[PDB]
Paper text:
RdRP comprises the subunits PA ([name]), PB1 and PB2 (polymerase basic protein 1 and 2). Subsequently, the PA subunit cleaves the RNA strain approximately 10–13 nucleotides downstream from the 5′-cap to acquire the cap/primer.
This mutation reduced patient susceptibility to baloxavir marboxil and impaired the virus’ replicative fitness in cells. Using X-ray crystallography, we solved structures of the wild-type PA-N-terminal domain and its [name] mutant in complex with orientin at 1.9 Å and 2.2 Å resolution, respectively. Compared to wild-type PA-Nter, the [name] variant had only 1.9% activity toward the ssRNA substrate and none for ssDNA. However, there is a little ligand shift visible in the mutant variant. Moreover, there is a visible movement of the Tyr-24 side chain in the mutant variant, likely to be due to the ligand shift. Thr-38, which is one atom shorter than Ile-38, helps accommodate orientin. Crystallographic study of the orientin complex with [name] PA-Nter revealed an additional point of interaction of the flavonoid with Thr-38 mediated by a water molecule.
Author numbering: -2 to 53, 73 to 196
Write the structure that this text describes.
């Protein structure tokens, strides 16, 4: 869907776009062909970045977007230095304030369905899950949202703006239907 490709290149910062293209190609997927996955990958990356800018300076270490060696360097480092259980999958962030890894979910489906799939995927209590939708819904572990409402509101409003713009360009219906 090349009109979606055009949208991704117009919508997302070039750093996010280049990171998403590398990520997909590493799984043998072509951004030019799986354009809905390209937009999805960019959105999750951007949310991960916005979330890391949510609170105090350096509250959050970013793990998402990092090459595997550096990602695992951050994760193993943190687990040696805080004694928190070493996750089996790379999470998205580490919360220095709350001493927990965070998995970040962005879903075109219902938040509760995605929360469960993440929980069942993770199989490790300590890691905090936080889900966003394009429709303003969000849900987190023990209903603990980590950030203040003003920072969550920027993320929720950004995801809404993205859905809206996709909608004006008749890309949203495909994109919504395309998810796992
Ligand atoms: O870099 C990638 C990152 C992720 C990813 C997704 C959710 C997270 O929460 C998360 O931390 C990371 O997913 C990717 C996927 C897929 O994106 C679907 C979502 O649109 C997922 O449902 C699939 O399961 C995935 O394999 C690709 O196809 C290619 C990719 O480079 C990636
Ligand atoms: Mn991740
Ligand atoms: Mn994630």
């Amino acid at each position: 869907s090349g009109s979606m490709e055009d949208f991704v290149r117009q919508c997302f910062n070039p750093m996010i776009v280049e990171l998403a293209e590398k990520a997909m190609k590493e799984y043998g997927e072509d951004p030019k062909i799986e354009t809905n996955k390209f937009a999805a990958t960019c959105t999750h990356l951007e949310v991960c970045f916005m979330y890391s800018d949510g609170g105090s300076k350096h509250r959050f270490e970013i793990i998402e977007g990092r090459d595997r060696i550096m990602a695992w360097t951050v994760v193993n480092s943190i687990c040696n230095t805080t004694g928190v259980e070493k996750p089996k999958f790379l999470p998205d962030l580490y919360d220095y304030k709350e001493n927990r890894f965070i998995e970040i979910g962005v879903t075109r489906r219902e938040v509760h369905i995605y929360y469960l799939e993440k929980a069942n995927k993770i199989k490790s209590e300590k890691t905090h899950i936080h889900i966003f939708s394009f429709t303003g819904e969000e849900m987190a572990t023990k209903a603990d949202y980590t950030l203040d409402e003003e920072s969550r509101a920027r993320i929720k409003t950004r995801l809404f703006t993205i859905r809206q713009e996709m909608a004006s360009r008749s890309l949203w219906d495909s994109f919504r239907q395309s998810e796992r």
